[PDB]
Amino acid sequence: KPKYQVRWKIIESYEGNSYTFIDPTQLPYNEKWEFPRNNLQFGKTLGAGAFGKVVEATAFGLGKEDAVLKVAVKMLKSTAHADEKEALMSELKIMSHLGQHENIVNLLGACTHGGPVLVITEYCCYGDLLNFLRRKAEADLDKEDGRPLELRDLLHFSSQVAQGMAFLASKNCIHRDVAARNVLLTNGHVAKIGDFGLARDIMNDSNYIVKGNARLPVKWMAPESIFDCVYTVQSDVWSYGILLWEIFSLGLNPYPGILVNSKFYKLVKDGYQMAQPAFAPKNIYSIMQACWALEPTHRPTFQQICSFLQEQAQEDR
Numbered sequence: 039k040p041k042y043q044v045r046w047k048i049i050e051s052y053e054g055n056s057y058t059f060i061d062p063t064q065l066p067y068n069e070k071w072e073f074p075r076n077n078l079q080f081g082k083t084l085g086a087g088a089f090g091k092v093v094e095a096t097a098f099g100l101g102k103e104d105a106v107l108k109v110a111v112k113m114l115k116s117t118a119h120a121d122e123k124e125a126l127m128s129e130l131k132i133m134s135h136l137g138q139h140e141n142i143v144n145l146l147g148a149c150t151h152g153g154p155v156l157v158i159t160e161y162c163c164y165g166d167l168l169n170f171l172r173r174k175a176e177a178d179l180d181k182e183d184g185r186p187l188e189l190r191d192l193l194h195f196s197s198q199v200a201q202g203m204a205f206l207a208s209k210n211c212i213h214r215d216v217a218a219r220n221v222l223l224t225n226g227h228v229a230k231i232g233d234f235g236l237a238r239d240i241m242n243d244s245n246y247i248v249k250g251n252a253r254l255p256v257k258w259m260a261p262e263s264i265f266d267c268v269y270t271v272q273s274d275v276w277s278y279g280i281l282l283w284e285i286f287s288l289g290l291n292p293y294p295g296i297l298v299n300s301k302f303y304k305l306v307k308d309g310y311q312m313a314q315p316a317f318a319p320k321n322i323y324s325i326m327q328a329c330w331a332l333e334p335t336h337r338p339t340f341q342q343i344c345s346f347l348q349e350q351a352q353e354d355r
Contacts, residue, residue: 040240040253042089042114043125044233046132047269049210057270062128065135073100073147073158078111084165085237089122090114092237094161100147109146112157112236123155130157136209141202143222143232159232162222166234167195170223172289190351191227192285192317197347198229203278204340206231207271214269216277217258218284219245245291247298257292261307262334272334278343279329286318307332321350 048060079096086092090113097109114126121127133145149156164170174187199221206213213220215233222230240246246253249264260276262268280292293312296302311330314323325346331337 039119041119041122041125042236043122044129044132044235045214046233047212047214048132048135049212060132060135062131063124065128065131067127067131067148067150068134071130071134071145071148072151073097073149075149075152075156078109078149078156078158080111084110085234087236087238088241090118090126090236092234095158097146097158100158108161108163110143110159110161112159113154114236116154118154126155126157130155132211136206136211139202139205141198141228141230142205143230160224160230162224162230164223164227166219167221167223167229168218168284168289170227171218171285175288187288189317189319190353193322193347193351194227195221195223195229195285196282196322197344197351199231199281200278200340200344200347202229202231203274204344207274207340212269212271213274213277215255215258216274216281217245217255218281218289221281256298256303260334261303261332264303264307270334271340272337275329275337275340276334278340279326282318282322282326282329283312283315286322287315288317290315 050058050060052058077098077100079098081094081096084092084094093111093113095109095111097105097107099105100107100109112126114122130145130148136142138144143162144160145157146160147158149158173182174184176182203213203216213231215235216231219238220232220234222232222234224230240253245255245257247256249256256264258277258280260273263273283292284290309332311327318326325338325343328338
């Protein structure tokens with residue numbers, strides 16, 4: 039139409055050489071997540087998109103009777119396209135199924151009776167990584183005032199996302215939209231990877247380009263995804279290299295000013311790459327370059343990258 043959808047996938051297998059993915063529609067909703075709508079106290083909108091919004095709420099009695107806890111709750115618009123209504127449910131499901139991790143935005147519960155479906159996730163008080171970076175980069179002190187960004191901060195964001203990604207990969211999960219806009223920062227500026235597409239307006243985002251069938255983040259995509267339509271863990275690693283660029287350029291748009299052709303697609307497949315970002319050390323740039331290997335199997339792994347970046351961040355004796 040297009041409709042709202044999150045583009046995560048989970049592999050069943052495995053055996054082709056072809057992938058068969060889980061149909062989330064057939065997954066069961068575990069009722070353990072159910073939370074009373076009235077035990078939520080709604081607050082400010084964290085982001086409102088074309089298909090729905092993401093709202094901050096205060097939850098009472100979640101996981102413990104006395105608990106008071108700031109949460110993020112996802113919801114669709116009143117005029118929801120019949121499903122969608124299911125995509126939000128899928129949702130949820132894929133996400134039950136994955137389990138918890140420190141560096142992913144975690145599911146906390148859901149409201150499925152007494153009104154429209156609500157999905158309760160972890161609240162992230164500093165918002166998305168992209169805006170944070172851009173807000174610290176802007177030169178005006180009435181807006182932002184704080185400690186100056188340093189290399190160690192950028193390494194922390196990078197290793198924290200890599201770790202979250204290493205987890206998903208371990209659980210046969212392909213994100214399909216790793217990007218600074220989808221990394222959210224929690225207490226102590228700890229990075230978490232999720233999907234914040236509901237909060238954004240996809241129809242007027244120059245990052246999402248009509249590629250025949252759908253509207254895809256082509257600048258963050260491996261050549262074989264464009265191609266060719268192949269998505270893998272290695273394909274998410276390519277997107278991570280783009281994310282690395284996003285981080286070490288402090289929020290600049292990838293391939294800045296490049297006319298997204300053709301042609302552009304062919305040039306990338308024939309091995310065009312972005313120049314070194316302003317604030318990337320040579321050795322971080324060489325991670326980017328490795329993430330953009332034309333041979334998917336020559337790309338590094340999230341765990342490798344994670345370890346390397348945790349090592350680099352280590353303050354000397």
